[PDB]
């Protein structure tokens, strides 16, 4: 079934069609590689998960993979955040929930 690596032809194709170069506007594309805070450039584009937050309070188009539960929790959380972004006095969530508090659970 052929090799794990690119062939001569596939490698030439990659080099001139896909490979990013230093002379390109974006020389490289990176992703967050994140950290846990509580426990302890140029031509480089860091993919952002937060810059399009105002696109997030609605379920986005799907192709073959349905949105998951945590995805819908995320969307619902973005919706809840939109609703209380311009408050506007005492928290709507506080009053919505405080009357159910039972001191035994805490």
């Amino acid at each position: 079934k052929k090799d794990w690596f690119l062939s001569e032809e596939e490698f030439k194709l990659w080099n001139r069609l896909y490979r990013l170069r230093d002379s390109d506007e974006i020389k490289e594309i990176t992703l967050p590689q994140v950290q846990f805070s509580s426990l302890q450039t140029t031509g480089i584009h860091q993919l952002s998960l937060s810059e399009w937050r105002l696109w997030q309070d609605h379920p986005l188009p799907t192709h073959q993979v349905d949105h998951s539960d945590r995805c819908r929790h995320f969307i619902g959380l973005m919706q809840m955040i939109e609703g209380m972004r311009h408050e506007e006095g005492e928290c709507s969530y506080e009053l919505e929930v405080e009357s159910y508090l039972q001191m035994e659970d805490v």
Partner: protein, 74 residues
């Protein structure tokens, strides 16, 4: 502060799909700690985000920008 074993147990049994599913005493006690770490991570990442914006307090804007990653790291 922190969560109580009883509360955490009611939050899990609230979502289980199999009514036969149970949680060991150690597991439940470990969850109490895990939930605490989760809340602090979110709160701390919120502070970070707001500080990177030279903001004075954590509003829902800064919390939004840390949400997706926070959910992915868990």
């Amino acid at each position: 502060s922190g969560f109580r074993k009883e509360l955490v147990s009611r939050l899990l049994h609230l979502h289980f799909k199999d009514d036969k599913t149970k949680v060991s005493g150690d597991a439940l006690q470990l969850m109490v700690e895990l939930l605490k770490v989760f809340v602090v991570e979110a709160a701390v990442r919120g502070v970070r985000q707001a500080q990177a914006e030279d903001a004075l307090r954590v509003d829902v804007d800064q919390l939004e920008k840390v949400l997706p990653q926070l959910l992915l790291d868990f």
